[PDB]
Amino acid sequence: SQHTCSISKVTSLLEVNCENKKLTALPADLPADTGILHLGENQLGTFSTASLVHFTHLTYLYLDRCELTSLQTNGKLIKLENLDLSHNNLKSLPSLGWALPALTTLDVSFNKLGSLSPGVLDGLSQLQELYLQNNDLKSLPPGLLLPTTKLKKLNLANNKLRELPSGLLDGLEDLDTLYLQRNWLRTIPKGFFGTLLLPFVFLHANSWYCDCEILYFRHWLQENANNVYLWKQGVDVKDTTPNVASVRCANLDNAPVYSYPGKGCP
């Protein structure tokens, strides 16, 4: 029948699926009570949140695979909890927190982000999950995660990170999963993990340099052998065994960092 999108409602939210419909623009005739909007596999190019301010039930918004080159956060989406911008061409992000106060899940994976601005996450006090994997990030700003105290999952894998801010994780007591595999990391700064307990941490495929400055990390690794994992496609970390040996000294023929003797270190 005639509406381009498929409209249904299995949960408490009216669900509108406009995926893969050769769209160039947002539909003009979306239902007023749209709660979940699927817009993936279209050719939107750009997206401004001002276009959805009048859908007062909108809670899930999927803009994945939309050819996006930019995002404007000029309209406030009061109820939005889940925003998916993955598999697009974003090179920068605007400030998100004024527009997206209720957000709990942000996915900006598979984009081309080269950096993040200082207060991009300011005001996202409810954020629980942040997916940034498969971008071009070279460093992260100081205080990035200070607005997001309830963060539970952080995925920074498959970027170009050269170093990490010393205080990146400070105070993130609910953080349970951390993915840093596939970066250009050579060391971990003293105090990086604090007294945080992180049951699922992935640190492999970096180029750790084993010398006297890797000793904070070696100790942490020994103490958290039970919490370091090898990422395995399509398999939930809960069905995998820990593998502390996955973390290796690139300058010592990939011998594991956990067993690095530190010979002749003060």
Swiss-Prot record:
Highest taxon in the source lineage: Eukaryota
Domain LRRNT: 2-32
LRR repeat start and end residues: 33-54, 57-78, 79-100, 102-125, 126-147, 150-173, 174-195
Disulfide bonds: C5-C18, C210-C249, C212-C265
Domain (LRRCT) ranges: 206-266
Protein name: Glycocalicin
Source taxonomy: Eukaryota, Metazoa, Chordata, Craniata, Vertebrata
Full-length numbering of the shown residues: 16 to 281 of 734
